[PDB]
Amino acid sequence: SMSYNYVVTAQKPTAVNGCVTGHFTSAEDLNLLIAKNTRLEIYVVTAEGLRPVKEVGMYGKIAVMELFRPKGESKDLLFILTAKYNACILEYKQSGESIDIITRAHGNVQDRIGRPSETGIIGIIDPECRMIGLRLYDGLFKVIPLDRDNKELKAFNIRLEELHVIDVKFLYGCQAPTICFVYQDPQGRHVKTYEVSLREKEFNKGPWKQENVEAEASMVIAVPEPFGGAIIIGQESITYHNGDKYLAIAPPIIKQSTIVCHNRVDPNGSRYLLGDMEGRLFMLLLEKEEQMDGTVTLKDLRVELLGETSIAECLTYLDNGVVFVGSRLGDSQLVKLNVDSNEQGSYVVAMETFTNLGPIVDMCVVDLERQGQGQLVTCSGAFKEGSLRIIRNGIGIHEHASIDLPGIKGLWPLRSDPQRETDDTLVLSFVGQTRVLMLNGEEVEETELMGFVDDQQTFFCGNVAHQQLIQITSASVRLVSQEPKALVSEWKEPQAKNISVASCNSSQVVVAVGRALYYLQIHPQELRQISHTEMEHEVACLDITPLGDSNGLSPLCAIGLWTDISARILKLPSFELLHKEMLGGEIIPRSILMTTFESSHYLLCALGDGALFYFGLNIETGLLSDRKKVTLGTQPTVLRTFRSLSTTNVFACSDRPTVIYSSNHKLVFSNVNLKEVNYMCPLNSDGYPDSLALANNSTLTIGTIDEIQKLHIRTVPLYESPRKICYQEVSQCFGVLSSRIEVQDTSGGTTALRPSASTQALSSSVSSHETSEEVEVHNLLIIDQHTFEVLHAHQFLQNEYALSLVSCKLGKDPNTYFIVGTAMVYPEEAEPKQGRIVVFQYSDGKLQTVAEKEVKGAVYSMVEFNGKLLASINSTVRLYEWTTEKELRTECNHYNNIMALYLKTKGDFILVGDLMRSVLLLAYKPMEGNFEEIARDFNPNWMSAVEILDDDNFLGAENAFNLFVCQKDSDEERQHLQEVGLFHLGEFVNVFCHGSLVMQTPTQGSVLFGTVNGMIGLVTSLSESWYNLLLDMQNRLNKVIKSVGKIEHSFWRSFHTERKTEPATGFIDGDLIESFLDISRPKMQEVVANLQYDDGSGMKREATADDLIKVVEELTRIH
């Protein structure tokens, strides 16, 4: 069992798996809810756009997500079902700034027997909220009655005679709850209804008889009153049914591509949006026919093409012509629908684009810029959405000026013009001195500013009330008129003692002299002394940033003190103590700041040692709450607000410059990708708009900052599907396997749907579902590592699929090659019986074929192996040598596989991942020239990816979203690999690769993985003693953290396939561990009660809160 692993999220899933609108946060709000695997994102729809309210993680994959409103509820409730059959009903509760998702009802609805249906879990709710219906398995329909008594969500099953249901909905306008569904039997596809009897717990005959529908009828729409009835969407037809009523259309406009989603635009069902696999967006329009009895029937159906979106998993109309396009295969979007078409005749205009990395089908890590700074390059998306994505940690700065100028001690922007809205002045402090720089476009020049002194050190200067400037120095506070620039007022301490600390806003000043504080107000031509006090200790730092709807005025003074290392909130003008916090230690506070993020207020206080304490701040009572602490460096941190893209954030200067910001109403910290920064200020001038001034010991820089986020993503559109990637350092390029769909005609020809990377390369060579006829045409792309231009595309043979790709040298040949493994794909073949290995050389802008090898199967995987080429081909693993004639030649073979899909190697060891029989360990035996089977995992697993952790530890991912770790057994029972680690990840892993995105203690090793949902994860190793500590922490965390839907963490992480359910073992959930930094202090104290740790050999010692914070902080830095 001596494998201990830790798995943590580096990038949360980005794919959208579902989306609903309604009134969840309040009756009056319009909400958009988005499901991204295990995450629920809640937004309020505004004219501004989407306002984020709350993101809630759940301990499950979200399979069903629907809003509904029982009689007596003031706003919508939310029904969630997870993939592990956890059902819950949730309520949004907001009290002040505290947001809580409360569980109204919960229970697990898994049955002991059943076959999961082809078109998946379906969950539907009756319009009248009488019941929830679940299609979990073939032949069964599960009913959860919605009585107020049913808090355990007890359910009953009804036998469903139709075994193969495609889609199902509850109908509107029905006296009894009534389902309408499409099902398939040997006689074709059919639409049918049943009423659902709560009394009989059984179906009753439906209100209208069944009809035959199109062979590819796939979606049921329940149309609201006054239409009622159902619309059935197929590939070639749309039909409406309401009993003594049938209407069908066969509009040719839809036949080109499968329609995969729908959404109702109007409450009464007059219009619907439809989306297809080529991102076409249609409007479906229902024309009313009146009747004498006042009912409405359907006169006609029409479909109109509006334009193109991302390929939509889901569409949600948000009012006022705005649509959310939720994409699994490309970026999500907000689009606007216009009444009038544009130039090319589209009614659709993209408003906003949201990054989706998924699916990540392959990836690699390259130090693209600096040595030691790995970046992840993914094969992302599919079809027209396909892309490369380049992911890197930290926030970049774009330097636009650099001036040699040592000894800077402070920076302040100033508008010397009272008319101009932009800064035109940068003021610098030095020891004992001040200098003023004017900004004329890009020119930066020394200048004097009348009223300001140059022979004292400035602690603050800026624009202030009544069209005035202020300069606060060690000697005095100077107030200066704007026109002309004259000294209009000067404040000094009564005996002209030095000012030691300064804080200022537009209308208020607070200065310290040693222990003394003075509060001044800025009036026309007057610095007015209001009040003063003597602090118990010397003053270390001050802030009076006004917060909230305060009209630029602060009733509060934040202060840090020497000696007791206190952060205090004082009232102005009295200086009455509202709150005191002792921060501990013997290192003084250096920087203190009152701040607002996402409409919450905080106090930030940084010590000389790199520690940052932060608290919730009540701006009415002065109360500080829920202390947290991070570490931002080993030097003093200086804090300063700036604005980028209409949000205020805080820049933290230290040896590790950082931006502090908010996400999901919690503070976040992201590294800035710069060396040590001592000082900074925002600067918005004509020549340097929306910019930052930065200083170190020697230099002043002016630049702009990138988006404020943990990870930067660059996108390279390919407009076709990338499949595999490898890096070739000697060529300074990537090789990328890609495929594009073409459409075949009745003769000998196929045609592309659009230009894409493989059709738009600089040069090209050849060898000698998206649509509803289709063929995949595969290519090797050569892409420049700097410009990501497509330099060359090589096209493979007709019906040749490119499966594997490696860049390597072989044998005694100094050249580096791109090598590709393929399969010839024919329709009748269960698996391929033919493939090739092709060795290419990239020289002088083109790919040349150096050698080919015909093999009798699909070449699924290839790896460089000790100067030889290792390949898996159908059920065979084969080692090839590169001969003097530049030909591949078989050395040895292994045959004991079903389908050898995945290879990794380490030394002479080979890890083989099979379609259905898990993993196998081979050794190449150099003195025999053959393989030896060392051990295999005799537990069947349907593999998706493999990795070697070390000589003794083998990591697998399988199709049911689990990880496992195999080891050799601690006889020829040595032939049995032991599954010593098990963990339900809840993602589908396509790729593992050794590497790190962090610039290169508790953990060893770094394995990244990429998933279908665009999630990037990390696996690393732990010692026994570190594992035990972290397991104990998990157990304690799980007793204090309330889970949404009352799902147990242990249940969620349990290994779960069709053959085996077991508790997780040998795996720490780093996402859970990291949440230790987000819990309250009471909870934190609870976790730590009598918690001990082993030190590495025997001795057990107490684990303190503060030491555990440091532990978890270290852990966050591994990604």
Ligand SMILES: CCOc1cccc([C@@H]2CC(=O)Nc3c2c(C)nn3-c2ccc3nncn3n2)c1
């Ligand atoms: C990376 C930053 O970590 C630490 C930072 C500060 C203090 C500690 C304290 C003391 C210390 O030196 N060790 C320690 C601690 C705590 C809680 N756990 N812990 C273990 C646990 C398992 C283990 N296995 N080998 C060695 N250890 N040390 C840690």
